[PDB]
Amino acid sequence: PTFPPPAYPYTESWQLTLTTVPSPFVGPADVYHTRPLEDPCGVVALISDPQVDRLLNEAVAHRRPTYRAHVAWYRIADGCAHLLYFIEYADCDPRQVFGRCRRRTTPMWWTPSADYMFPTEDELGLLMVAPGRFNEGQYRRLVSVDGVNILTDFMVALPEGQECPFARVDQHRTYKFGACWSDDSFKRGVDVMRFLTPFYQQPPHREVVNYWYRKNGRTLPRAYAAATPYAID
Amino acid sequence: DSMYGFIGTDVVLHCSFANPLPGVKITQVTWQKATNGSKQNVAIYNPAMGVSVLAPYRERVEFLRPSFTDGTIRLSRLELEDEGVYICEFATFPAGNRESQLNLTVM
């Protein structure tokens, strides 16, 4: 597997304007449900358009040459959130698809989950490869364009019974989901690189998850069915 | 691996990566302490953007020579609270995250 080149040119750094994780408790959130797994060794598609291109059309409407942005994912427990993902953008072109930015940070991941989860090609959805049952729970995505936030909650359900025989379950035993934070703690400031660690951009992240998956007999699906506003079964 | 250090003193923590096969790129090294229930990161090195040291270690932790053939930092002025497991996490391609561990005892 060759190391993927960047997609487009961009200056890559560890940080831009934000040194602390933005709060996910920043308003109500539209609820979606990931579609059920055919078999527990499959892939779960936390996918759902946040209709962020409107905010890109307005930036062209008001004639702003660039927009800034950031995306973050969270695991919601009880009154509090676990970190999962964060990435920041700067000088993005509103006339292009989301993410086409001259300045971006390396994604910051919670590494145990990075072993079998990785972003989609549009950078707005997540893919959960062959998950153990413990991955059940509520996942919140924060999309922010020019200070304006779009929250989505994804509820992930998996069959009781069968757990995929090669699911990554080792790190979880030891570290689990990591520290659980309240809106207070977010306000005080939860350092991005203290609790999240820099990783590969979406293309090389994909090749590593793909390389592990293959090594277990499976292969990444070509396309993924988005999440629904309702439960199935 | 087990290491021993004395208070007020300094210890040199090593990164124990074994044999990096052909043809894995080693992209990154992250130092991590297991505390309270999970990890938090202590310091990170990446030839791409260099070196970062995180609170509360901002004035006690420093890389020696920045490399994966090393991975070696210096803890200064040891404290009871430093005892514990230190993880050395390596971001390799295409193998993914590879880690090693050491127990520190402060006497």
Swiss-Prot record, chain B:
Role summary: (Microbial infection) Acts as a receptor for herpes simplex virus 1/HHV-1, herpes simplex virus 2/HHV-2, and pseudorabies virus/PRV.
Keywords tagged on the record: Cell adhesion, Cell junction, Cell membrane, Cell projection, Disulfide bond, Glycoprotein, Host cell receptor for virus entry, Host-virus interaction, Immunoglobulin domain, Membrane, Phosphoprotein, Receptor, Repeat, Signal, Synapse, Transmembrane, Transmembrane helix
GO molecular-function term, one example from the UniProt record: cell adhesion mediator activity
Source organism, top-level taxon: Eukaryota
Domain notes: The Ig-like V-type domain is involved in homophilic interaction in cis, a prerequisite for cell adhesion. Ig-like C2-type 2 mediates neurite outgrowth through binding, induction of phosphorylation, and activation of FGFR.
Subcellular location: Cell membrane; Cell junction, Adherens junction; Presynaptic cell membrane
Self-association state and partner proteins as the record states: (Microbial infection) Interacts with herpes pseudorabies virus/PRV envelope glycoprotein D.
GO BP term (any one): homophilic cell adhesion via plasma membrane adhesion molecules
Disulfide-bonded cysteines: 15-88
Species whose genome carries this gene: Sus scrofa (Pig)
Domain Ig-like V-type, first and last residues per copy: 1-105
GO terms under cellular component: adherens junction; cell projection; plasma membrane; presynaptic membrane
UniProt record similarity statement: Belongs to the nectin family.
Location, primary (coarse class): membrane
Shown segment, full-protein numbering: 37 to 143 of 515
Glycan-carrying positions: 36, 103
Keyword Repeat: yes
Annotated protein name in UniProt: Nectin-1
